[PDB]
Design a protein around this nucleic acid. Structure first.
Ligand SMILES: [Mg+2]
Ligand SMILES: [Mg+2]
Ligand SMILES: [Mg+2]
Ligand SMILES: [Mg+2]
Ligand SMILES: [Mg+2]
Ligand SMILES: [Mg+2]
Ligand SMILES: [Mg+2]
Ligand SMILES: [Mg+2]
Ligand SMILES: [Mg+2]
Ligand SMILES: [Mg+2]
Ligand SMILES: [Mg+2]
Ligand SMILES: [Mg+2]
Ligand SMILES: [Mg+2]
Ligand SMILES: [Mg+2]
Ligand SMILES: [Mg+2]
Ligand SMILES: [Mg+2]
Ligand SMILES: [Mg+2]
Ligand SMILES: [Mg+2]
Ligand SMILES: [Mg+2]
Ligand SMILES: [Mg+2]
Ligand SMILES: [Mg+2]
Ligand SMILES: [Mg+2]
Ligand SMILES: [Mg+2]
Ligand SMILES: [Mg+2]
Ligand SMILES: [Mg+2]
Ligand SMILES: [Mg+2]
Ligand SMILES: [Mg+2]
Ligand SMILES: [Mg+2]
Ligand SMILES: [Mg+2]
Ligand SMILES: [Mg+2]
Ligand SMILES: [Mg+2]
Ligand SMILES: [Mg+2]
Ligand SMILES: [Mg+2]
Ligand SMILES: [Mg+2]
Ligand SMILES: [Mg+2]
Lengths: 61, 89, 65, 102
RNA sequence: UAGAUAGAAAAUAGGUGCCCGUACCGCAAACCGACACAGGUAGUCAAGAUGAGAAUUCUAAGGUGAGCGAGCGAACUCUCGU
RNA sequence: UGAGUAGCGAAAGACGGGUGAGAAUCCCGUCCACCGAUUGACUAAGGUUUCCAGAGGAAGGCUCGUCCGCUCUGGGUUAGUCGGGUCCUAAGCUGAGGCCGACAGGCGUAGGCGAUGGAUAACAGGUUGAUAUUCCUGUACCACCUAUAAUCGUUUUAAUCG
RNA sequence: GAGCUGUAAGUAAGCUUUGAUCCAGAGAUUUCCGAAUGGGGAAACCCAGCAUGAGUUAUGUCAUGUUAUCGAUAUGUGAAUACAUAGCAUAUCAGAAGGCACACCCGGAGAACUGAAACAUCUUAGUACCCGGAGGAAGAGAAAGAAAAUUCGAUUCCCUUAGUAGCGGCGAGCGAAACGGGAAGAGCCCAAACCAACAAGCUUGCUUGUUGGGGUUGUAGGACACUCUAUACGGAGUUACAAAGGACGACAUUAGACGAAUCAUCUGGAAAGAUGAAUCAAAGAAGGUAAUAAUCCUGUAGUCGAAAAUGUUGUCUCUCUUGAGUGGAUCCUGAGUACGACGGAGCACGUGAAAUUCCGUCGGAAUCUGGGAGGACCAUCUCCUAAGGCUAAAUACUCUCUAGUGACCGAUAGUGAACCAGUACCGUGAGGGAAAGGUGAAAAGCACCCCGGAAGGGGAGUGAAAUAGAACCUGAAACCGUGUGCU
């Protein structure tokens, strides 16, 4: 139950592929980082993806 | 509610010996307590109750033809009168 | 007793009638237990009378609301 | 049923075909009727029962209602029955004479 | 002790005190073993003679004669004695 | 079919008298034998009416059966003090918020549940076909309530509760 | 409209034309467990608080209501810590929960046996199972579409295209789409520019935010400016396009009513059969009745019927609501988006020359002289206008109700279950899982006598039949007996 608080960015599933094209299930996890932002006008430490943090679009306070 | 607490009198050899001893046996609602039984008897028969003993009887297996079942469970009270008497007949 | 007579009776009279019918039913059950009741249909009669009395009382306290 | 207790009927099928008699009982759930002197059965009665005397008792047994036919009040012939409405009341009518049966 | 509040009771007398279980089997024919099954089933009590003893043999209290018998007294098998 | 064959599951019975349509097999009696740290007496689980009385003999009972843990009918279990709850907690279980986790869910704090342990007031005798520290007799104890109370208190208190 | 108190017989006591029983609509009652919700718990039990009441001299006892958790909205209070923020307390909520129809739908996650005559890519298969979310349908949907002409004009579904084009250890296998023909059809609302009101920053410049108006696009549209048109005239509507009602009417469903017409004889226990002579038919569907009935019964064709509730509809009412053109100066037209790289996935398409579409990570535009697509890519041409939302119908399925149908079964069949079956029984449990229909038209179900303790039987009787006597129609074979002709 871990996802980006801002965008909902979360892990997905897919395959690891060998040179012989053998397939095993794997996940792509989001680049989530625990940051303190303003939630409902109050500080709160939440999981936010690096991309949601990019370009100062999320205010860390 | 007293008429609901008391269901019917029990008439058996042991119950008749008890009655000779001034002890009256009743089947009562399976949910009531000894105190409710005492109060119901005193209200219905205008007696003074010396004491009440009470006991439970499990459902008893009973057969009729090919049908198996059980009798109702019973709660039986034995009321010892302090003053007065009860005439069941 | 029938619903029309019960509806002519007053609320207090309905309650008193319920009490007296319950006492009558209780005496009938005791006679039946002791083996002294030949007219067993009185039990059902009185039970249905009580049911009708309670029906009418509930109807009245419903229409009040 | 179209036959009713007390009616005078003619037996149109059975051993008693042609006999006339009074309907003295009906069994609606079986569609059967009992007609005096019709369908006599001899039942073995034990004297040991609540009736001291016993033996062979003869009594009418029920007959299927479609084997009896109402008799026309005028012509006394067997007749089927229709229904009219007189002042909002159903009246059984003999289909041969048109007269009210009762 | 922090707290609480006019009132507290040695005694005397009187009264009130619910629900559940309680039968019966329980080293067993009633429990676990498909059985009225030589198995298994925690704990308590456990007398006399003998003896170190709860061993041994015979008894007490108490319980039991075991849910096919009657004959005969071969081979052979089993258990036992010489 | 095998075949009226294997088997009928640890053991000591005998006789007399009853009952009965019927008796090695049921009842009663005498003698005999067996266990006796027990095949005796309690009792926890487990079973769940198998318990008692009257009646029965199809089936069940490894035979028989008049008998039975079987069938039918009606009965039988009584508590302030015994064991459990209205007391306590152990392991463990559960678990508000909480932490973690694709979902499902997992973990876990406070708090609860949970005896196999801690606490906890009744004994002897009598009594039924079947219950008894439960019923009855006698004599107790515990908690609580009401009234009257020797005596003590009467607002920093000082009796009392805590 | 005459009987009735179920299976279910009996006895008893009763009910009922002053209208039972019974059938349909509505209502009242509806113990305890169970999401189970006062707390606890080994479901159907135990133990409480609070308020009010009953009872008692009082205690004990009892009745009713209420008391779970989370969420949301309010009110009060409020730590470290000053301001107030955790937090805490109270009140309200037809807020959630849990179930299921082993179906259908969308999504998360996702096998293996198997096939490839082995096996790893591939296949099985995005299947089974698990999980979440539904809805009566879901999903999709009003072109950044399909194409290449005289172009078409949302989506979905059927036929076809076609086992084609392609994909593929180019193996096994996988496998379209457009065009064409059909079912059904319906189109809309925002964001932004701009205008007005309000509040903060107080340049008290005019910036930000909220509300309302305005606006919705490719034939580029809108703002903006100007010119007409109207204050509901018209138009539209609770299936999107905003959202609640009311009155009346119709029809339908949930009980019912009427409803034609056959007699005789023969056989026979019984006639509906046979024979003879009749009759009705908008009714010759069917079942029953003592054998095979259009005319005996229940019905059928046809016609009629509703106090009440429900459903679907029509008209009023109600509610909401302006609609066009001209201009090209400026402005707006969805950004961490499109897109790119790496790693995956999805596209019939296995990374390939790989367009078209998604996920993770990192980087990262343009602004109508713009942007996307036509299977790498570039140019030209052509067609569209992404990065916001809604939307009925044609399609899928059947636990269920109503009426029906079958060259479907007929008791080892048909459901596992025609019968008291998910029972008995087996298992700690999940779970597995049977056998078992037929007297007779009618119970007329064998009075009475006899042997016998009973069971059972022999008579007698009922019945057409007992040789139909109770798992009682028929009654094959295996198998078991008795007698006997030949041996
Ligand atoms: Mg007790
Ligand atoms: Mg006991
Ligand atoms: Mg005992
Ligand atoms: Mg065994
Ligand atoms: Mg041991
Ligand atoms: Mg020894
Ligand atoms: Mg022999
Ligand atoms: Mg031999
Ligand atoms: Mg031999
Ligand atoms: Mg032998
Ligand atoms: Mg033996
Ligand atoms: Mg016994
Ligand atoms: Mg025997
Ligand atoms: Mg939680
Ligand atoms: Mg203990
Ligand atoms: Mg005993
Ligand atoms: Mg509860
Ligand atoms: Mg292979
Ligand atoms: Mg192969
Ligand atoms: Mg939809
Ligand atoms: Mg190759
Ligand atoms: Mg709408
Ligand atoms: Mg009719
Ligand atoms: Mg005829
Ligand atoms: Mg007719
Ligand atoms: Mg790639
Ligand atoms: Mg391209
Ligand atoms: Mg592109
Ligand atoms: Mg091209
Ligand atoms: Mg164009
Ligand atoms: Mg649709
Ligand atoms: Mg057959
Ligand atoms: Mg079957
Ligand atoms: Mg079957
Ligand atoms: Mg037969």
């Amino acid at each position: 139950g871990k996802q980006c608080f801002v965008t909902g960015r979360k892990a997905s599933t897919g395959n690891r592929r060998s040179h012989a094209l053998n397939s095993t299930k794997r996940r792509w996890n989001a680049n989530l980082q625990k940051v303190r932002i303003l939630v409902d006008g109050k500080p709160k430490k939440v999981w936010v993806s690096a991309r949601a943090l990019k370009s100062g679009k999320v205010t860390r306070v | 509610e007293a008429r609901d607490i008391l269901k019917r009198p029990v008439i058996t050899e042991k119950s008749s010996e008890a009655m000779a001893e001034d002890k009256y046996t009743f089947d009562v609602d399976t949910r009531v307590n000894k105190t409710q039984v005492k109060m119901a008897v005193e209200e219905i028969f205008n007696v003074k109750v010396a004491s009440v003993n009470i006991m439970n009887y499990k459902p008893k297996k009973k057969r009729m033809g090919r049908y198996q079942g059980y009798t109702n469970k019973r709660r039986k009270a034995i009321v010892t009168l302090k003053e007065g008497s009860i005439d069941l007949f | 007793m029938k619903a029309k007579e019960i509806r002519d009776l007053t609320t207090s009279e309905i309650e008193e009638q319920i009490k007296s019918s319950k006492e009558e039913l209780f005496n009938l059950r005791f006679q039946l237990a002791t083996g002294q009741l030949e007219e067993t249909a009185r039990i059902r009669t009185v039970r249905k009378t009580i049911a009708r009395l309670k029906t009418v009382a509930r109807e009245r306290e419903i229409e009040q609301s | 049923m179209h036959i009713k207790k007390g009616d005078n009927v003619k037996v149109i099928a059975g051993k008693d075909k042609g006999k006339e008699g009074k309907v003295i009982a009906t069994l609606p759930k079986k569609d059967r009727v009992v007609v005096e002197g019709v369908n006599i059965m001899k039942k073995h009665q034990k004297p040991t029962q609540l009736n001291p005397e016993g033996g062979i008792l003869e009594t009418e047994a029920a007959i299927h209602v479609s084997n009896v036919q109402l008799l026309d009040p005028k012509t006394n012939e067997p007749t089927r029955v229709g229904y009219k409405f007189v002042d909002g009341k159903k009246v059984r009518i003999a289909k041969k004479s048109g007269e009210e049966i009762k």
